[PDB]
Design a protein around this motif. Structure first.
Motif, PDB file in Angstrom:
ATOM      1  N   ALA A   1      33.208  41.161  39.226  1.00 50.32           N
ATOM      2  CA  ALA A   1      32.905  42.580  39.064  1.00 50.32           C
ATOM      3  C   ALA A   1      33.230  43.058  37.653  1.00 50.32           C
ATOM      4  N   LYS A   2      34.365  42.619  37.103  1.00 44.90           N
ATOM      5  CA  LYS A   2      34.721  42.997  35.738  1.00 44.90           C
ATOM      6  C   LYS A   2      33.723  42.435  34.732  1.00 44.90           C
ATOM      7  N   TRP A   3      33.297  41.186  34.931  1.00 44.14           N
ATOM      8  CA  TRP A   3      32.291  40.599  34.053  1.00 44.14           C
ATOM      9  C   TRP A   3      30.972  41.352  34.149  1.00 44.14           C
ATOM     10  N   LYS A   4      30.586  41.758  35.361  1.00 44.69           N
ATOM     11  CA  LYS A   4      29.369  42.544  35.531  1.00 44.69           C
ATOM     12  C   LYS A   4      29.481  43.893  34.831  1.00 44.69           C
ATOM     13  N   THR A   5      30.650  44.530  34.914  1.00 48.07           N
ATOM     14  CA  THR A   5      30.855  45.801  34.225  1.00 48.07           C
ATOM     15  C   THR A   5      30.743  45.629  32.713  1.00 48.07           C
TER      16      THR A   5
ATOM     17  N   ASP B   1      37.999  40.793  25.635  1.00 45.78           N
ATOM     18  CA  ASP B   1      37.417  39.453  25.571  1.00 45.78           C
ATOM     19  C   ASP B   1      36.075  39.354  26.288  1.00 45.78           C
ATOM     20  N   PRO B   2      35.913  39.830  27.531  1.00 46.21           N
ATOM     21  CA  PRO B   2      34.566  39.829  28.125  1.00 46.21           C
ATOM     22  C   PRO B   2      33.571  40.677  27.358  1.00 46.21           C
ATOM     23  N   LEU B   3      34.016  41.780  26.750  1.00 45.23           N
ATOM     24  CA  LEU B   3      33.114  42.592  25.939  1.00 45.23           C
ATOM     25  C   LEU B   3      32.603  41.810  24.736  1.00 45.23           C
ATOM     26  N   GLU B   4      33.489  41.068  24.068  1.00 47.46           N
ATOM     27  CA  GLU B   4      33.065  40.262  22.929  1.00 47.46           C
ATOM     28  C   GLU B   4      32.185  39.099  23.368  1.00 47.46           C
ATOM     29  N   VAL B   5      32.480  38.509  24.529  1.00 48.58           N
ATOM     30  CA  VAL B   5      31.699  37.368  24.999  1.00 48.58           C
ATOM     31  C   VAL B   5      30.295  37.804  25.402  1.00 48.58           C
TER      32      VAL B   5
ATOM     33  N   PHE C   1      25.724  40.492  19.085  1.00 39.76           N
ATOM     34  CA  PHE C   1      25.762  41.764  18.367  1.00 39.76           C
ATOM     35  C   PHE C   1      27.204  42.018  17.949  1.00 39.76           C
ATOM     36  N   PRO C   2      27.658  41.379  16.873  1.00 42.43           N
ATOM     37  CA  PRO C   2      29.053  41.523  16.435  1.00 42.43           C
ATOM     38  C   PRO C   2      29.311  42.677  15.476  1.00 42.43           C
ATOM     39  N   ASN C   3      28.349  43.579  15.283  1.00 46.39           N
ATOM     40  CA  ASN C   3      28.551  44.725  14.406  1.00 46.39           C
ATOM     41  C   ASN C   3      29.560  45.720  14.959  1.00 46.39           C
TER      42      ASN C   3
END
Lengths: 90, 56, 106
Positions: B2-6, B35-39, B44-46
Motif C-alpha cells: 500500500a505504501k509503495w502504491k501511494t 526512499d520509495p519516492l526516489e525509487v 525524474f531526479p529534478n
RNA sequence: AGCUUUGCGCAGUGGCAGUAUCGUAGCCAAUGAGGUCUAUCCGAGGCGCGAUUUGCUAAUUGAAAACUUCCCAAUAGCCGUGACGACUAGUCGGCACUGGCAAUUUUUGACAGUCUCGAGACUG
C-alpha cells in the motif's frame, strides 16, 4: 517577513539571506575552469564529453543536437520563472 | 505494498503536472517514504526529497 | 542547407537502411528484387572525403504496400558482412518543424 | 407500427493480467472428464507446451546512441601628436592615436519616495 525597503540595500540582502539566496613573492591568484563559449559552466561529465569530442574531432549528431536544443530551451524556460484556474473551477 | 502504491501514485501525479511546473523539492512528512519516492521517480531526479522533521 | 532530397522527392515509400557494415553492401545495396523498383532513387550514405560509410543509407521503394511487405519479410536479413534492417524514414525538414511547434504547444 | 431475447461483428468505455488470456498442435473429450459434491446425483472439461503481443515519447550510458555532407577564415566620439592641402609665427577639413577623458556648463546621471485636484505640495 521583511519587505523591500526603499533606498536601502540591507533589507534586500536580509530577504535574500532569509530566503536562502546566498621568486618575486606573492600568492597565486589562479582559478581555472571549463566554461563553454556560451558562458555556461560545463559539467565535469559535459566537460569530459567536450574534451573527448575535441580529441576525436567529431561533434554531436542531428538527434543529439535536437535533444540538446530541447533541454536548453526547457532549462531557459524554467529559469525564466494554475492556481487561478483551480480557484475558479472550484 | 500500500505504501509503495501511494508513492507510485504521488510520482504519477507529479508526472501529470508539467515538467515546467514540477516541484523542485518534495518535502515528505513520512520518514520512510523518501526512499520509495526516489525509487518510483528515479527517471525524474529534478525533485530533491528534503526532510521536514517538524510535521505541519 | 542540404540539396539532396531534390533527387528523391517522388512521394514513394522511404525507409531507413542502416547499421550495416562500412563496406557491406557498398554498391549492391539496391540490387535486391523484393519489389518492382527495389530501392528506387536510393543508395548508401557515407562520410565524404573518408572512404567510409556512416551507417544509414537511403532506402526508397516506389510501392508503399510492396515496401512494407518486403521490409516485414526482409527485416534484418543477411546483407553482406552485416545483416541490416529497415525502418521508416524521417523526412523531417524545417517545414515539418514549424508545423510541429505550432501544433505542440497550441 | 415501436421494443426486445442468444446476442453476434464493428467502434468507444470500465477493469483485469502469471493463478490469469490464448494456441495447446501431445492426449482424453457430447459415443460422459470427473465425486465429499449432485450420489439411483449432475453431465464438459482436464492433464503437459509456450508467451502476453503493436507503436510513440522522454530520459540513460557512451567520444559518437544514428535519416543524405563537413571542421575552417577578413568580408558580403573629444583634446594633443607628424606630415600632406589651402588661407595671412597663427587658422581649417581628412589620415592613425605613440597619452588622457568618474571633480561644478553637456556622458558615468541629485536622484528617489509620498499625497491631492494636465498641474501643485511634502520628505529622504
Amino acid at each position: 517577513e521583511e519587505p523591500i525597503v526603499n533606498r536601502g540595500l540591507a533589507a534586500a540582502l536580509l530577504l535574500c539571506q532569509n530566503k536562502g539566496l546566498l621568486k618575486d613573492g606573492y600568492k597565486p591568484d589562479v582559478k581555472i575552469e571549463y566554461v563553454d563559449e556560451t558562458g555556461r559552466k560545463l559539467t565535469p561529465k559535459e566537460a569530459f564529453r567536450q574534451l573527448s569530442h575535441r580529441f576525436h574531432g567529431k561533434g554531436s549528431g542531428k538527434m543529439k543536437t535536437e535533444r540538446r536544443m530541447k533541454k536548453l530551451d526547457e532549462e531557459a524556460l524554467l529559469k525564466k520563472m494554475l492556481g487561478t484556474v483551480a480557484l475558479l473551477q472550484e | 505494498l500500500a505504501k509503495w502504491k501511494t508513492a507510485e501514485e504521488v510520482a504519477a501525479l507529479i508526472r501529470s503536472l508539467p515538467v515546467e511546473e514540477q516541484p523542485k523539492q518534495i518535502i515528505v512528512t513520512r520518514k520512510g517514504m523518501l526512499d520509495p519516492l526516489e525509487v518510483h521517480l528515479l527517471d525524474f531526479p529534478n525533485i530533491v526529497i528534503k526532510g521536514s522533521e517538524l510535521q505541519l | 542547407e542540404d540539396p539532396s532530397l531534390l533527387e528523391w522527392d517522388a512521394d514513394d515509400f522511404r525507409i531507413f537502411c542502416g547499421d550495416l557494415g562500412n563496406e557491406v553492401n557498398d554498391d549492391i545495396l539496391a540490387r535486391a528484387f523484393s519489389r518492382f523498383p527495389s530501392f528506387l532513387k536510393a543508395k548508401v550514405i557515407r562520410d565524404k572525403r573518408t572512404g567510409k560509410t556512416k551507417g544509414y543509407g537511403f532506402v526508397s521503394f516506389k510501392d508503399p504496400s510492396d515496401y512494407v511487405r518486403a521490409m516485414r519479410e526482409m527485416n534484418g536479413k543477411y546483407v553482406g558482412s552485416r545483416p541490416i534492417k529497415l525502418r521508416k524514414s524521417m523526412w523531417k525538414d524545417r517545414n515539418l518543424d514549424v508545423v510541429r511547434k505550432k501544433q505542440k504547444e497550441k
